[PDB]
Design a protein around this nucleic acid. Structure first.
Ligand SMILES: [Mg+2]
Ligand SMILES: [Mg+2]
Length: 476
RNA sequence: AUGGG
RNA sequence: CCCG
């Protein structure tokens, strides 16, 4: 987005800190080229002449403005996509009660009880539990108030910046490219959930190519479903974006909200409203306050869904802007935020599409390494989605999500103190799909010290997961 | 944060 | 814990 004002106030906002990621017995062994993002203005690993505070905000390099024409084309695209979505999900989009919004519903997890609460709550020690009752799903007075203000389109707030504490490729660490998290007020999350919760649950329950969304999928079971679909197309593209979330422009965001979340579709009227407040935001970094236009903050209830919907719309728009006669079935896709797979029997020129995405502020490039541009004829077994390949399970015949050994090695090499056992068990569910040899190599460093689930047991688990009759079958 | 799983 |  575009930073329209870096104001400065004494009232400081504490984030800094050391990393919670400690190396494991495995690191020595795998020597990953990844490490914990720099979290300190002066980390002893930051290339000379780097200012975290600098790099970290070097993502706001503008807010693309659209012509009346391009805007009119984008509104058609969003209306065309909204027609498809809601035709599939239905129009059962009524607001959630505060109870439903808190405790979740079929397809929508419960709000989280002890995560950051946002502001001004942060500045008083207060936590969500001191504001909300996740037991019965009722809210305390401050939140009661905020809501009535929101119902009265009169509520203002600020995002709170955290430096994401995660593992990263050394080159990005040594460059100060640490990612940031925007924590919204816990009441904003509540009210979004209220306004767009049931729609969301429906999105999750109907995840798939038909709506172009994989939010709520479970790769273990759904890979087979996703793979067979995309395997039927002549062309598949692994399209990458660059700072997708930050480069959504006010025009696009505003127009999407207006077309997809209309009352004619059964949404409360403040559905559009609460979403729009995401367009221009104030971020609080330590002592600094910062106004931005464009982009989408990371911790908004519905960030992944919003992103996914934009992603679908961008593709329709880019294509319509270059070709004639493009409709929703000229192609197929599924996305999860910025992550996307597209496919078509038409020989679409994504390379040519590149300027059209540019009109929206979006830069696309091919996942396929830094290759010489988009090419034709790629297959589903050539792409990555959610950091997983689609490989054929040479046993069940089913697709399975295979992660790159390198990635698993970086994953296994670092861990929060006193979380290693559970981390190992959880990462083993990812690694099983790399086959028994790679599975055993990956975990040897932990042998004799931690409990490593047998490859065998996780394979049996996965078969029953992916297809119980497959499982039941292996036994007839 | 988010939201999935 | 892991992915966007
Ligand atoms: Mg990307
Ligand atoms: Mg990709």
């Amino acid at each position: 987005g575009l930073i329209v004002d870096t104001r400065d106030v004494e009232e400081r906002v504490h984030v800094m800190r050391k990393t919670k990621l400690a190396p494991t017995v495995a690191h020595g062994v795998f020597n990953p080229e990844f490490g914990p993002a720099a979290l300190s203005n002066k980390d002893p690993r930051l290339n000379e002449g780097v200012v975290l505070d600098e790099v970290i905000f070097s993502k706001h390099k503008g807010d693309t403005k659209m012509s009346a024409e391009d805007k009119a084309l984008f509104r058609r695209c969003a209306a065309d996509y909204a027609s498809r979505l809601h035709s599939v999900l239905g129009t059962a989009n009524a607001p959630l009660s505060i109870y439903e919004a808190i405790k979740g519903v079929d397809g929508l997890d419960a709000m989280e009880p002890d995560t950051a609460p946002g502001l001004p709550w942060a500045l008083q020690g207060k936590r969500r539990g001191a504001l909300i009752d996740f037991e019965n799903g009722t809210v305390g007075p401050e939140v009661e108030a905020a809501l009535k203000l929101m119902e009265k389109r009169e509520y203002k707030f600020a995002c709170q910046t955290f430096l994401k504490d995660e593992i990263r490729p050394m080159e990005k660490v040594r460059a100060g490219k640490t990612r940031i998290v925007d924590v919204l007020p816990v009441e904003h999350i509540l009210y979004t959930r209220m306004m767009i919760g049931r729609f969301c649950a429906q999105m999750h329950s109907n995840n798939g190519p038909q709506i172009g969304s994989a939010v709520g999928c479970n790769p273990d079971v759904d890979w087979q479903r996703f793979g067979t679909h995309f395997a039927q197309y002549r062309n598949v593209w692994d399209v990458d974006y660059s700072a997708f979330d930050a480069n959504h422009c006010s025009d696009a965001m505003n127009i999407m909200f207006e077309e997809v979340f209309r009352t004619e579709f059964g949404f409360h009227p403040n559905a559009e409203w609460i979403l729009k407040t995401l367009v221009n935001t104030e971020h609080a970094y330590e002592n600094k306050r910062i106004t931005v236009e464009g982009g989408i903050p990371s911790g908004c209830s519905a960030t992944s869904i919003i992103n996914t919907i934009l992603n679908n719309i961008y593709v329709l728009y880019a294509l319509r802007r270059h070709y004639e006669g493009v409709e929703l079935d000229t192609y197929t896709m599924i996305s999860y935020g910025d992550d996307i797979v597209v496919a078509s029997d038409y020989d679409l020129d994504f390379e040519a599409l590149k300027p059209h995405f540019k009109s929206l502020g979006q830069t696309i490039t091919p996942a396929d390494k830094s290759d010489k541009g988009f090419v034709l004829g790629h297959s589903i077994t050539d792409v990555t989605f959610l950091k997983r390949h689609f490989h054929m399970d040479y046993g069940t015949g089913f697709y399975k999500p295979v992660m790159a050994s390198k990635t698993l090695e970086a994953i296994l090499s670092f861990a929060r103190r006193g979380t290693i056992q559970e981390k190992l068990i959880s990462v083993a569910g990812l690694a099983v799909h790399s086959g028994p040899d790679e599975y055993r190599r990956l975990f040897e460093p932990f042998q004799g010290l931690f409990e490593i689930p047998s490859y065998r047991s996780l394979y049996l688990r996965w078969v029953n997961a992916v297809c119980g009759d497959a499982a039941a079958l292996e036994h007839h």
